[PDB]
């Protein structure tokens, strides 16, 4: 066993909801990476959109950061494929465990971002640095990228 590393990166925490959207995992990528080895490793550090609820009137969503990947006993469908990997999300200073099926695939609304930020601003936690966003993103690409645009 060995290790050693520490120090502040010195950067800005997602100046906008876009940067966060850049590293905003997608059910698809998940459904695909769900069959990849570097799944949890990758997904870990990204961001997904969870739909706490919806109801009949106004939608509801919250930004969460994947802290890891757990393993359930029950399996569920995910666009045809059946997976059993619980996405370890963290809402502010509170952890959680949702499913890919729930993991939406939309651009972090200007609200959600700010709404989620609140949890971070309340807990005094820090968001993803433009550096991490890129670095991380660069990982998403390598992981599996069809095209840029």
Curated annotation (Swiss-Prot):
For the Plus3 domain, which residue ranges apply? Answer: 14-143
**Location in or out of the cell:** Nucleus, Nucleoplasm
- Assembly, per entry: Component of the PAF1 complex, which consists of CDC73, PAF1, LEO1, CTR9, RTF1 and SKIC8; the association of RTF1 appears to be less stable than that of other subunits. At least in HeLa cells a N-terminal shorter form of RTF1 is also found in the complex. The PAF1 complex interacts with PHF5A.
What does this gene product do? Answer: Component of the PAF1 complex (PAF1C) which has multiple functions during transcription by RNA polymerase II and is implicated in regulation of development and maintenance of embryonic stem cell pluripotency. PAF1C associates with RNA polymerase II through interaction with POLR2A CTD non-phosphorylated and 'Ser-2'- and 'Ser-5'-phosphorylated forms and is involved in transcriptional elongation, acting both independently and synergistically with TCEA1 and in cooperation with the DSIF complex and HTATSF1. PAF1C is required for transcription of Hox and Wnt target genes.
Comment, domains: The Plus3 domain mediates single-stranded DNA-binding.
Name of this chain's protein:
RNA polymerase-associated protein RTF1 homolog
Q: What is the originating organism of this protein?
A: Homo sapiens (Human)
Gene that this sequence comes from: RTF1
């Amino acid at each position: 066993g060995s290790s050693g590393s520490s120090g502040p990166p010195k950067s800005q925490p997602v100046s906008l909801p876009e940067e966060l959207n850049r590293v905003r995992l997608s059910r698809h990528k998940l459904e695909r990476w769900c069959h990849m080895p570097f799944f949890a490793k990758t997904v870990t550090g990204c961001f997904v959109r969870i739909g706490i609820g919806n109801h009949n009137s106004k939608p509801v969503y919250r930004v969460a950061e994947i802290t890891g990947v757990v393993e359930t006993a029950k399996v569920y469908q995910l666009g045809g494929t059946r997976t059993n990997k619980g996405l370890q999300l963290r809402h502010g200073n509170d952890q959680r465990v949702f499913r890919l099926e729930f993991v939406s695939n939309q651009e972090f609304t200007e609200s959600e971002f700010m709404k989620w930020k609140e949890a971070m601003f309340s807990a005094g936690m820090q968001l993803p640095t433009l550096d991490e966003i890129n670095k991380k993103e660069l990982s998403i690409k390598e992981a599996s990228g069809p095209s840029s645009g």
